[PDB]
Amino acid sequence: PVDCVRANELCAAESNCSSRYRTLRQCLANKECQAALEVLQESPLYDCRCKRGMKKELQCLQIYWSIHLGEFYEASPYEPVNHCLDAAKACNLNDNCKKLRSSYISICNREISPTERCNRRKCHKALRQFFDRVPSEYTYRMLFCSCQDQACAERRRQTILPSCSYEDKEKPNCLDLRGVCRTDHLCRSRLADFHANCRASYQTVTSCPADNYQACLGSYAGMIGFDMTPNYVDSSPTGIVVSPWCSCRGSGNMEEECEKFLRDFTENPCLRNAIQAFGN
Amino acid sequence: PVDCVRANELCAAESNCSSRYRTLRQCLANKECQAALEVLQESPLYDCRCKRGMKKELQCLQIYWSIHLGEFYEASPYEPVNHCLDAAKACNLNDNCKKLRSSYISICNREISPTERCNRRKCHKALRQFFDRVPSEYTYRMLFCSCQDQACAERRRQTILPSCSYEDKEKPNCLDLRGVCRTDHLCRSRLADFHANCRASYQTVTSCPADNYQACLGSYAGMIGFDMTPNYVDSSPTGIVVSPWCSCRGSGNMEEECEKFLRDFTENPCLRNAIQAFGN
Amino acid sequence: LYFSRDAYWEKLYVDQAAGTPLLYVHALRDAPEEVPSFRLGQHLYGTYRTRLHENNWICIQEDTGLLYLNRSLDHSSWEKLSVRNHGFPLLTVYLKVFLSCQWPGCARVYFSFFNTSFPACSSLKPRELCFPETRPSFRIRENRPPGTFHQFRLLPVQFLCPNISVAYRLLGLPFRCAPDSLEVSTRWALDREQREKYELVAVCTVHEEVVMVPFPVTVYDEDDSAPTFPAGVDTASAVVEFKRKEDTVVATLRVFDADVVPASGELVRRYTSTLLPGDTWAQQTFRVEHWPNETSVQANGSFVRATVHDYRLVLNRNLSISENRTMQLAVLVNDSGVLLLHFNVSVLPVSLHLPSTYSLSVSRRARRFAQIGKVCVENCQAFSGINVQYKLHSSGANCSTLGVVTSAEDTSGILFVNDTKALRRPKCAELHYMVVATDQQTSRQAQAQLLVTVEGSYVAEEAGCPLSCAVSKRRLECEECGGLGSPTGRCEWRQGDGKGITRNFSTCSPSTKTCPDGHCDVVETQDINICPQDCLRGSIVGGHEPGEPRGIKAGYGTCNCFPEEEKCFCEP
Amino acid sequence: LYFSRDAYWEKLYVDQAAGTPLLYVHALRDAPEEVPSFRLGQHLYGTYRTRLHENNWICIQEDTGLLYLNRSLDHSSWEKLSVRNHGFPLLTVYLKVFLSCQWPGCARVYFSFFNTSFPACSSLKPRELCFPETRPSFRIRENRPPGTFHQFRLLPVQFLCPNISVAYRLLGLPFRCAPDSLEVSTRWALDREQREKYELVAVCTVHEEVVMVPFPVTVYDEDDSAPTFPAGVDTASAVVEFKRKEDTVVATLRVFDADVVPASGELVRRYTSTLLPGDTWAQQTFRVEHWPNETSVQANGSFVRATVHDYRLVLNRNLSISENRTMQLAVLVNDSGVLLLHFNVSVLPVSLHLPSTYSLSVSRRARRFAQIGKVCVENCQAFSGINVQYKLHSSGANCSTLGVVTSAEDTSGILFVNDTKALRRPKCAELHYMVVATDQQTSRQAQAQLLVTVEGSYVAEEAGCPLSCAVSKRRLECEECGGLGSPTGRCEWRQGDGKGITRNFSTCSPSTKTCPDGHCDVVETQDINICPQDCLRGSIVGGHEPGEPRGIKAGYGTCNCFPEEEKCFCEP
Amino acid sequence: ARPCGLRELEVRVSELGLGYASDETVLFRYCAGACEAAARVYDLGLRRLRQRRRLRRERVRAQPCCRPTAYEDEVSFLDAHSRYHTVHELSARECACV
Amino acid sequence: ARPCGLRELEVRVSELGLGYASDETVLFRYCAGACEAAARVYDLGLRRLRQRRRLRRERVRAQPCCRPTAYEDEVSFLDAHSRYHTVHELSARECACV
Ligand SMILES: *[C@@H]1O[C@H](CO)[C@@H](O)[C@H](O)[C@H]1NC(C)=O
Ligand SMILES: *[C@@H]1O[C@H](CO)[C@@H](O)[C@H](O)[C@H]1NC(C)=O
Ligand SMILES: *[C@@H]1O[C@H](CO)[C@@H](O)[C@H](O)[C@H]1NC(C)=O
Ligand SMILES: *[C@@H]1O[C@H](CO)[C@@H](O)[C@H](O)[C@H]1NC(C)=O
Ligand SMILES: *[C@@H]1O[C@H](CO)[C@@H](O)[C@H](O)[C@H]1NC(C)=O
Ligand SMILES: *[C@@H]1O[C@H](CO)[C@@H](O)[C@H](O)[C@H]1NC(C)=O
Ligand SMILES: *[C@@H]1O[C@H](CO)[C@@H](O)[C@H](O)[C@H]1NC(C)=O
Ligand SMILES: *[C@@H]1O[C@H](CO)[C@@H](O)[C@H](O)[C@H]1NC(C)=O
Ligand SMILES: *[C@@H]1O[C@H](CO)[C@@H](O)[C@H](O)[C@H]1NC(C)=O
Ligand SMILES: *[C@@H]1O[C@H](CO)[C@@H](O)[C@H](O)[C@H]1NC(C)=O
Ligand SMILES: [Ca+2]
Ligand SMILES: [Ca+2]
Ligand SMILES: [Ca+2]
Ligand SMILES: [Ca+2]
Ligand SMILES: [Ca+2]
Ligand SMILES: [Ca+2]
Ligand SMILES: [Ca+2]
Ligand SMILES: [Ca+2]
């Protein structure tokens, strides 16, 4: 599969496909749009994907979402891929994980004013930099580490430093938070990536699509650093409950859709089986 | 008085004077040359001088000697301007004289081969750099310091490091050495400067032109660093005898001119009175 | 007209014969003139809104709303579909069903296809004989004429295993299961405001197994409630006297509404708050801020939810002191039934007079930048948005010793020794000042007398002393030497404890009430030699915890500081 | 015709009357047909060849050669001249005097002008009454018909003070002062080759003072001497056997000449050396180099000077060994009277055979790069321009231990241990080599036998030893441990003295005959761990004196070296 | 003897004695060794001037002590009270005999 | 105490003890003083690790010694035998508490 940047380059090598692509881009952002679509269905821009932590990821995602024709689930534009104290020790004894860990901790723990707890945007950017370019035998061992008491679960909850990046002054509605995340380009793509590898199915024996725990943990860890940031709700040892910082209050006649959105975090059997099996 | 570089610049501001200057320069290096001369006699290039240690001295001397019409004495193209151990102490306690002293000593005392005693050209260049841009209360106090025994006179003779820059394998003829020096541009100008401030005259009570000891010492110290380099012939305390590294042998029928050239160093009353009076 | 659900479910197999019924659909109506038509979509959609092929196999009966099979199937027709899925495994297709794609105007019907054939009648567990895998959830709008919304029989199961006796049963409820026909209907019309959720249990009996399945029904709302006061309160009175800042909540009142339907997207467009005109001073100084919040109220022993709209009245600019007005304001509330609100406001002016005499003293051994006392307009810690600066005016004009800076935290002025030379003279021993309290927006002012007596002996200073108190490290080298900010000429040693990195760290300060306090006031920020351990911009060496704007918030053991290098050391 | 001097002198004053004689001139002649004309230059020149004004005051008599005054002077005419001097003070003007500006064709006459008038006859000292300030010096060519060259009377002095009796007197001499007329003439013609200088004393008697003045006459030369052998030697025989370098002085012979006149500028153009042809091998291998030198010979108890021309015959290229020739060469010498020179040359070939057997041993404890012995063609230190390299050829081809490098200083090869593994084996205990002595220009060679027995026990090495001997600092840590270049396995400590910075500095070396020697031979320059104190390119810390290509030439106290960092320490 | 350079160690944070009550493990790179082949003419001159008591009786250094040139940036950790801490310049990166 | 920096002295060449037999006077700029306000967290950590004998018993430095950063280039002189000598890097130019 050819990614969308090289697909844009091969589209730039011709005139007709580039003309139809710019035509549909000017129409989106009758008889013209349908002609541009029936040309671009055979293009290499059609069925192009992106990758995780690649060079110029945002440009690939801008190429992708500019030809999406518009909705609860969306197609993922990606390649179809005390224990916690010991994990912190194994990150500190490295030289890349130590530098990026101290980067996001020293940014996210900088109190500015008595009203502003921290600088939010640089904290989220440092979290994205830590969970993009560190190998996944260090970022997962710290984040999914099975516990048997309160101190282990508290160290595990305090990993993404929830008092700055997770919490807020208020709990917004989950549908409005989903609209805020779907306005963005990176957050929408990571949310659609989470809604592809961690759904629940009654067919498989492990409730996951194609029995891939690694894809579910990779889709979960790719959301830390955005507006739809999940973390653990409490310091309970055994009960592994994740959710964003939202709630179903103030929904209106969309209580069922909002609870069905929140059950994919709170009561997802695939994600709980994946975290518990990585614990084993 | 306007120096010859600014005179060349003011000559470049007009067309007729520049055309006659380039005409005479192409003729030298009847009815054309005499016309160019009778134009350039009223030019600012006529009666222009140079200075000692100025910016771009060699270009000023190239401007001067390109309009000289050709001879024992020549006109100077310049502005008409233990004690030795204590002098060495006063040079070492400085920060400019110390650096340039250690420069010329470390260059002139670098033995290369069993046949070549030293690198001659860099030694002469370092001597010129020391006796150009050090103030003259340091270069004269080391070079003209009255002595009363042998060790003082030997330290005084060893000042310009004679085993590298003064001596050679052979003593050439003084007329051939004068021709070698007059082929050069800097050496010819420093020799003509010495033949203007240290001549002997029977009119003054001090045998010097206009009773100026400072001009004679400045004209003597400006020759160290060239082919006609003077120094002391021996370590005698009282007898102050200077000469170049030449002799009157092999002269032919020009013995009288060669001895008359050498008496301006060996038996000059103005120069001996100047050195002895600086000793007082 | 609206569908009772949004997503229907059905299992498909291989070589299912023609004329095999798949499922029923149900469309509850709104008015007694409507007959539910049912048209199918012309595309067998696949995964993630992908067209595969035009619908040529599943037909529909518009009258009873019956999805059934018109044609048969084979492996070639499904390998025809699984190629066009664009790299995805064919797991579930779906159709669109119109009725006259989103709820309520449309409903999509899923179909899970199995590669195997139809299994035997004895090979099926009764759990897969009674109810599908995806349990339903039904949607009924309130205040609507009731009808039929569900049917129990899995039609291919009884079409292909007709000899199994399967019964269905439900447990003053408005629902009913009809006898000898397994439709489910509702007796009377519903209202959410009495009860909103109905959880039931559908019971399936096979031959022999009894299976219980949860059965959720959620009642949806219309805007059938005009807004209501909590208890009779239509007016709110408040006095604007001391705060006067740019945005201060003056008055606040609740509005109760049982309606929920204008939700958080369209609540701005519908619940309308209009401040009624009449005076431009109100509309240039006040605004009406509105936000809702949902609460839960009881109806008949259950919990329904309703909205509580808080309307508050917020300042818009810094009010001047010279305002002496009172008004009544009218707010209109529109629930798109109309409500009116009243606010009594009273903006009272402020007198800013001072005490007549300030009598205080100062030692002769004191140094530059030493705090003595405070000047303050009498209502000190109640001003919020008012700038009040203080000055000095010496009557003798010869003996300038003291100075005043305006700490805007309390809006008070601090008396500090500025000149050490005039303080040591025996001529300037009784100083008379005229303190003037000014104002920035209006030129109103006040004045008071300041008599200060300079009292004490004088001892010369040691040449081995540094310029700050914080350079000393121990107790004996702190208390036997003086610094810069001291009010008496000597430094004060405060002792912490041995509890690790704490806020109580032992140090040498000019004043133990001002320097290790955690705030860098206007006196200490003049020249950084006074109190570096509250005001520095540098680095702390040792186990520490940094101050939040600046300073040392916590340290381990003793903490001394070199302000000439911007460095501190915290160490036991 | 030629003037007896070159620069004439005369003093001028203010308001000197017309018709006042200034001076006489004298022009000695060459042939008995010449009458000396005298024309003046048309420019009163000033300082440094500067024209001032056309000559309009000083006239000349061509017959007697008399410079006299035609017109008078005043202050206006000299202030007219002193303006045109171009920034120079008017001190001396001069005229040019032609006769048919340089000697002998011209002579310039100086005039010193005084601002004062003519002084009184009693105001003049007799020293300023007899002779001028610039004493004369006269020039007479030899072998010329003699005449009159000087006159005594200061003409304005006797013209303006005629009543003072002033007499002049001189002391087998060829000169004479005429009676009753103060001209000075020469009796007979002169030759420089008998006597070249005549110092006389002119005696002036006034009224009354007797004044003595030196009176120099220098006799000038012509080319009146054909060249001469020293004593009969016309041939020089020399044998070219061992040196054969590019430029070696083969033979040398003197040529005596009393002539001096072709001086060092024109001696190349006149004294001509021509190598006579006949064989191209001589002209491609030999050249005739020529240089003069002046000596002093006695004639009649005096010292005259003459030239001695050394003619030598120098090689031109590296001669091959296969030359077996002999020749006689002829050189022509031209004194522009002609001379012929002969050279017997004999170029003998060189045999390069070796001794038949080289028997030597080596210890088993030895290390890599340890010098054992020398291979050398028998006439060792007599080859100069011949490249002779040496090789090895092992007969067993299994036991490669030794190696040969060619030191071109002596043109000899050095036997050094190259492989330590093959030396410690008990199988390779008697080694047989065939040493081959080659040649670069011609492929002639020789060969010899090398039997070497490897003898000794073996002791293992300490793990606490460094890789070089020079890392050790004291005597006990030097002699109790081994290095790299040692021939026996242990290092050798040489002790210097306490005489300051000397060439005899105490150190630890592999071999005290090779390492602290002052030369970095071909063995030591392979890997720099062997002998850093003769081969390093680094820095020496302490009182030292650096080696002239490289190394330590002198050090103070003990000198150790770290070659891994290129550093040495010299310290007591 | 061994030349001066980087040495490594793995220590608990509470063993550093800074006052932090934590239990995580940090990597500690210090400089260690002995300088022998780094003395210069300045060192011999200043040592000989100390030996004659020519100095003004102050604290001078006539042997090159081996100190780091640069340091690492940040080490962050967590403690027993769930409170992160960042330590600046705790360990070395480059050892030089200055 | 006084902070560490350049100090100057004027000495005979024979007093330096290098072995040169001369009588000229040279200017000698050394570094002197005491460092108090230059310790870092590395210094406290390495000192506390020495106090528990955690180290491997080597030569470590837990106080910043004050050494020069750069040196002067050349000092040339003459001796009692009329023989010039050039000494490289005899005195300091920049003092720093490294
Ligand atoms: C709404 O009311 C709940 C009741 O507990 C409260 O927790 C929440 O903060 C309120 N939200 C707002 C925006 O007032
Ligand atoms: C404000 O106005 C009322 C109206 O009469 C007056 O009585 C009162 O004195 C005024 N306030 C002040 C501070 O003057
Ligand atoms: C409430 O809003 C609706 C829609 O704008 C409007 O038609 C109606 O008149 C408003 N009610 C009042 C009392 O203005
Ligand atoms: C209003 O008052 C506050 C409180 O002092 C002040 O910070 C702010 O700048 C003021 N704004 C205006 C517009 O005067
Ligand atoms: C303190 O005195 C200085 C010196 O004149 C002056 O510049 C400064 O304004 C004074 N401070 C006050 C608050 O008066
Ligand atoms: C010439 O002879 C003299 C005699 O002493 C000697 O000193 C000089 O070196 C000789 N010069 C040459 C070039 O042979
Ligand atoms: C050189 O030539 C002569 C001529 O007969 C001969 O006798 C002699 O052997 C030759 N030299 C050699 C080395 O062969
Ligand atoms: C010597 O040289 C002169 C000038 O070149 C020439 O005329 C004369 O023939 C030469 N003598 C001989 C013998 O060649
Ligand atoms: C001549 O021999 C010398 C001596 O070995 C050598 O240095 C030089 O390169 C040789 N020249 C030629 C041209 O062979
Ligand atoms: C010494 O042995 C090495 C290793 O094979 C070889 O490269 C080198 O040429 C040898 N040296 C001699 C002089 O043979
Ligand atoms: Ca209702
Ligand atoms: Ca309502
Ligand atoms: Ca309602
Ligand atoms: Ca404070
Ligand atoms: Ca003759
Ligand atoms: Ca001759
Ligand atoms: Ca002759
Ligand atoms: Ca050697």
Residue numbers in the entry:
A (entry chain D), B (entry chain C): 37 to 65, 75 to 115, 121 to 131, 159 to 357
C (entry chain F), D (entry chain E): 29 to 128, 137 to 207, 211 to 246, 251 to 379, 387 to 622
E (entry chain B), F (entry chain A): 100 to 197
Lines quoted from the article behind this entry:
The same procedure was used for the structure determination of the 2:2:2 NRTN/GFRα2/RET and ARTN/GFRα3/RET complexes, leading to reconstructions to 3.4 Å and 3.5 Å resolution, respectively. A recently published medium resolution (5.7 Å) cryo-EM structure of the NRNT/GFRα2/RET complex displays a similar overall architecture. The segments in GFRα1, GFRα2 and GFRα3 corresponding to the helix-loop-helix-loop motif in GFRAL are much shorter and adopt extended loop conformations. As a result, interfaces I in GFRα1/RET, GFRα2/RET and GFRα3/RET are much smaller (buried surface areas less than 700 Å2) and likely weaker than that in GFRAL/RET (buried surface area ~ 1500 Å2). In contrast, the D1 domain of GFRα2 is resolved in the cryo-EM map of the NRTN/GFRα2/RET complex, and packs closely with the D3 domain as seen in the crystal structure of the NRTN/GFRα2 complex. The D1 domain of GFRα2 makes a few contacts with RET-CLD1, which may help stabilize the ternary complex. However, there are large differences in the angle between the two wings of the batwing-shaped complexes, which mainly originate from the different conformations of the ligand dimers and their different interfaces with the co-receptors. This angle in the GDF15/GFRAL/RET complex (~60°) is much more acute than that in the complexes of GDNF/GFRα1/RET (130°), NRTN/GFRα2/RET (105°) and ARTN/GFRα3/RET (108°).
